[PDB]
Amino acid sequence: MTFTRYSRLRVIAEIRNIVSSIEFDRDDELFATAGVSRCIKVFDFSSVVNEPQCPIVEMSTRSKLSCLSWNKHEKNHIASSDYEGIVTVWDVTTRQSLMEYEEHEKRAWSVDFSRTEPSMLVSGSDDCKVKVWCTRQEASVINIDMKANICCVKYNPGSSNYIAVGSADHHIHYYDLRNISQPLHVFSGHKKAVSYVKFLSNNELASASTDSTLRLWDVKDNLPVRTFRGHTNEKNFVGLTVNSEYLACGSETNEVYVYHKEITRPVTSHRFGSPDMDDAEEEAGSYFISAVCWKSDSPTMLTANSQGTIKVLVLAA
Amino acid sequence: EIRRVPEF
């Protein structure tokens, strides 16, 4: 029943370079995109779905962007991490940078605003440090020296005391920020760098890696659960988004994949740029999906690829 | 390459 509830992704809207990050605001009303074009763009979701297209805010940045995270309490605030290492908090109504955190010494691949302590945000960098910041303070409040490049950091959705850290050392380091001498647990299983970590719930953590797998982990009992396979991801950040039941990720075949958390093989997938009639130009391997984001626990998702095309997709029977 | 994931 679960495997067969949905068999396809329907395209319900399309905006037609690399988009590194696509994220919904606190209420799933606006979404923002950012990437190599050094421009944070904010769109109204309903307008995109209903109309035959223009962002409502554009904020120019000095450096290429790697990640966005909206504040979970302050509707109008969004954080970005950039390739200079700067972690910026922006106000999308005034367009101003509210904070410019400059301690990282190399590109910051990831930033995440906490859901439960919403002034707290965490970043990770090629400088091998995890930094925790508070929007009321200019200096970092916690620093973890990880000794390998950090590709992704994510707060637990139920408590700001726990973060998952995906590392180029192939492991997920799960920290209690109240005692950083050692992580609570380090999860091994991926055979390549861990590019994303995202929580389905307080106790369920998912990861993506350039070993062409996603993995599901139990962070209450510190157990491996399941490995998901089907997509191609051997090189790039191709996006990971999860909700209470589903995982979605990109692929280096210009395809989005969806998995139900209980089944190791995809429930469906969607090709960007499938040829029609006599089309005979670039092959599928020439583009990658670069960012994905569920609309909370619904079957609706945002997706973007390395050409800059954005699609709103919906799981359907 | 700008989105290449690092290896240790």
Author numbering:
A (entry chain A): 348 to 363, 372 to 407, 411 to 675
B (entry chain B): 39 to 46
Paper text:
HY5 (Oyama et al, 1997), which is a COP1 target acting downstream of UVR8 in the UV‐B signaling pathway (Ulm et al, 2004; Brown et al, 2005; Oravecz et al, 2006; Binkert et al, 2014), also contains a VP peptide motif (Holm et al, 2001). In order to compare how the VP peptide motifs from different plant light signaling components bind COP1, we quantified the interaction of the UVR8 and HY5 VP peptides with the recombinant Arabidopsis COP1349–675 WD40 domain (termed COP1 thereafter) using isothermal titration calorimetry (ITC). We find that both peptides bind COP1 with micromolar affinity and with HY539–48 binding ~ 8 times stronger than UVR8406–413. Next, we solved crystal structures of the COP1 WD40 domain–VP peptide complexes representing UVR8406–413–COP1 and HY539–48–COP1 interactions, to 1.3 Å resolution. Structural superposition of the two complexes (r.m.s.d. is ~ 0.2 Å comparing 149 corresponding Cα atoms) reveals an overall conserved mode of VP peptide binding (r.m.s.d is ~ 1.2 Å comparing six corresponding Cα atoms), with the central VP residues making hydrophobic interactions with COP1Trp467 and COP1Phe595 (buried surface area is ~ 500 Å2 in COP1). COP1Lys422 and COP1Tyr441 form hydrogen bonds and salt bridges with either UVR8Tyr407 or HY5Arg41, both being anchored to the COP1 WD40 core, as previously seen for the corresponding TRIB1 Gln356 residue in the COP1–TRIB1 peptide complex (Uljon et al, 2016). In our HY539–48–COP1 structure, an additional salt bridge is formed between HY5Glu45 and COP1His528. In the peptides, the residues surrounding the VP core adopt different conformations in UVR8 and HY5, which may explain their different binding affinities. Mutation of COP1Tyr441 to alanine abolishes binding of COP1 to the UVR8 peptide and greatly reduces binding to the HY5 peptide, in good agreement with our structures. Mutation of the HY5 VP pair to alanine (AA) stabilizes the HY5 protein (Holm et al, 2001).
